[PDB]
Amino acid sequence: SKEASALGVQNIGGIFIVLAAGLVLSVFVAVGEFLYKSKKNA
Amino acid sequence: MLKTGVGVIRMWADEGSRLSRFRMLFTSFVEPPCTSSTFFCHSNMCINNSLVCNGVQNCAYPWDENHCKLFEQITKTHGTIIGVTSGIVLVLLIISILVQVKQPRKK
Amino acid sequence: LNPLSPDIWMYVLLACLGVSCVLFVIARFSPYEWYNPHPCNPDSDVVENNFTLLNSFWFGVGALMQQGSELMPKALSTRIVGGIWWFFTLIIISSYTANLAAFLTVERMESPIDSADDLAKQTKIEYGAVEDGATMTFFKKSKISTYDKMWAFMSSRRQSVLVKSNEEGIQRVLTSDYAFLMESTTIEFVTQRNCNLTQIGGLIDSKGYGVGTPMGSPYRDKITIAILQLQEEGKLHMMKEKWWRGNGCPEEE
Amino acid sequence: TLLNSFWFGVGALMQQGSELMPKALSTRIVGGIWWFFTLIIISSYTANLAAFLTVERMESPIDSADDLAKQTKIEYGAVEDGATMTFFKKSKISTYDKMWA
Amino acid sequence: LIDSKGYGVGTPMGSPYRDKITIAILQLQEEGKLHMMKEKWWRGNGCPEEE
Amino acid sequence: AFLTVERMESPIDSADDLAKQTKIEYGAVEDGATMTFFKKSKISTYDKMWA
């Protein structure tokens, strides 16, 4: 009985990593779609 | 405990000069009961001239040099570093966002 | 705030804000969000997106809140970033509730000491007594495994914790943890001379208060019958009241 | 209105939300702060009930003779001719008299 | 507890074993076998697992 | 509640586990010096399981 343990990044880091991955994929697919629409319109 | 006020410590060695160590401490004023100048640690052990919290186990039990008693959130190993960098990223992003807050309109 | 370390909270908020900026720069810079306004719309030409800074920020907040939002993100980019955001939120709040469950339950299930053996299984809260005050001596001659190991621990400490004076140990217990084994009577007196101090467990030992008389004593049996009377009257219970119960009920807070 | 703002508050305390959402920034402050408090509450409650449901510290209402000597819903007992009745006869003392009577 | 009574041994007035048994009882209590045998013949199975 | 009870509970790995425990039952080829050892044992845990 010692488990008075505040959760810290050492036990929760993964969500931030997933966050950065999502951000980069967002940039990727967003510019891909914008240029796709620009090329299709022309 | 010395009953008198003058101490006598003799040591004998006989080609045993390497006798590991005799390393000990003597305390004054072990004699008087409490007065403001002094400090109580044990029964009739008010001794203090200055030895209140002198960084040495200055009494029989730890009583004298012994447990006398927003910047922390700043002092992080690298959480402070990447946190303030993230705040910088935030500020720049806000700078960018206010533009399209104020600049564009409908078609 | 306790279940979460005083860092993630700030990480939480900054992630919220950065995500929000990402969201809005996605929406107002997007080939899709621009929208025909009229409910019955015959291909108008005043189309626009439907995101503000205020809207996207509060939407991010609300999804972080598990209370929905007002904007319905539509395109691929906004939907994928919002999906990641929702994932962030659910995992964080789930973890939060798990941890708070952890604290409250690990608290509730603690069992504060209530018996001498239980103290023996304990390690942090120290043992001891007034040295050689016939008390630890009983432990010295003790045969009970609980008391055997209690004396073993005291021999381990061996003036590490063996107070010389009753009051000195009283201060020790007041300022820290301690066991401070000593006679019941003074204990109830002190406890009802004070607070913060509790009787714990039963009477580990049993001793009596008689009257001393020489071998030659006719008064022995006479005074014993006198005290049998006084006890059977409860009159000595009454005088206990006088000296403890009378002055041992000023302090029930 | 008063009616619908009230309805929003109550339905928001529980986790469903209303569609009288704040259209303006000022009212959104209230909306957000309210959301925060309610989430604090519901999560806290679930935690604490989980705490009881798996530890279940049973409690005894009574822990002293005087304690049940003052209530009445629990019946005492003693053996007939039991010396218990004799000592409790002639109670002589503060509270045992009420119980004996 | 509420009262305070003890149990003794049956002896008439002035029987020779009286002080001889007071001292023996004191000694046996001092070595505490009183406790051990009382526990042994009042032990029983003990509390099972209420967990 | 179920999951925390399940993870919390513990599979036994010691003789004293059996000593405290009561649900499951011991076993020994009686008179193979096994139970003789236990009854001749003066170890309180083996003593109590032997009893």
D88 reaches C (C-beta below 8 A): no
Under DSSP, is residue C252 helix (H, G, I), strand (E, B) or coil?
A: coil
A 10 A CB-CB count for D97 gives: 13
Which residues on chain C are in Cβ contact (under 8 Å) with E31?
Answer: 141, 143
> Which residues of chain C come before a gap where C and the next N are over 2.5 Å apart?
none
The experimental method behind these coordinates is: cryo-EM
User: Does the annotation list C63 as a binding residue?
Assistant: no
Q: By C-alpha distance, which of C76, C103, C187, F18 is closest to A25?
A: C76
Q: Which two tokens stand for residue A36?
A: 């796709």
DSSP structure string for chain E: ------------TT-THHHHHHHHHHHHHHHTHHHHHHHHTT--S------
Sign for the pseudo-dihedral over CA of C236, C240, C243, C245: negative
A6 neighbourhood in chain C, CB within 8 Å:
2-6, 99
In whole angstroms, give the CA distance from residue C135 to residue C204: 10
Other Cβ atoms within 10 Å of B64 Cβ, number: 24
Enumerate residues 6+ apart whose C-beta is below 8 A from C16: C60, C61, C64
- Given a contact cutoff of 8 angstroms between Cβ atoms, the answer to whether C88 and A18 are in contact is yes
> How far apart are the C-alpha atoms of B82 and B88, rounded to whole Å?
10
Resolution of this deposited model, Å: 4.2
Q: Which two tokens stand for residue C197?
A: 């101090």
Q: Say how far apart CA A22 and CA A41 lie, in whole Å.
A: 28
Residue where the block lists tokens 């395109």: C75
3-state secondary structure of B36: coil
Radius of gyration of chain F (CA): 14
A17-25 long-range contacts, CB within 8 A, separation 24+: A18/C84, A18/C87, A18/C88, A19/C15, A19/C19, A19/C84, A19/C88, A21/C84, A22/C80, A22/C81, A22/C83, A22/C84, A23/C22, A23/C81, A23/C84, A25/C80
Cβ <8 Å between B93 and C22: yes
Tokens of B13: 């060695």
| Rounded CA separation C15/C25 (Å) | 15
Is-contact C137 C181, C-beta < 8 A?
Answer: no
C61 touches chain D (CB under 8 A): yes
Is there a contact between C8 and A12 (Cβ–Cβ < 8 Å)? yes
Cβ contact C26:A26 at 8 Å: yes
Instruction: For residue C143, give the nearest of E4, E29, E32 by CB distance.
Output: E32
Which residues on adjacent β-strands are paired with residue C138? none
Per the document, the length of chain A is: 42
What is the C-alpha separation between B40 and B48, in angstroms, rounded? 8
Backbone angles phi, psi at C49, to 5 degrees: -65, 175
- Residue A25 near chain C (CB below 8 Å): yes
Q: Which residue of C has its CA nearest to B98?
A: C53
Count of other CB atoms within 10 angstroms of residue C29: 15
The shares of helix, strand and coil residues in chain F, as percent rounded to the nearest 5, are: 55, 0, 45
Other CB atoms within 10 Å distance of the CB of residue C164: 15
Q: Chain F, 1-51: which have a CB under 8 Å from a chain E CB? A: 20-23
Phi-psi region of D90 (alpha: psi -120 to 50; beta: other; left: phi over 0): left
The count of CB pairs under 8 A between chains D and F is 5
D84 is in an annotated binding site: yes
Nearest to D47 among C101, C234, C238 (CB): C101
- Answer for the pair C33, C75: CB distance below 8 angstroms, yes or no: yes
Amino acid at B50: S
Q: Which residues of F are annotated as a binding site?
A: 33-34
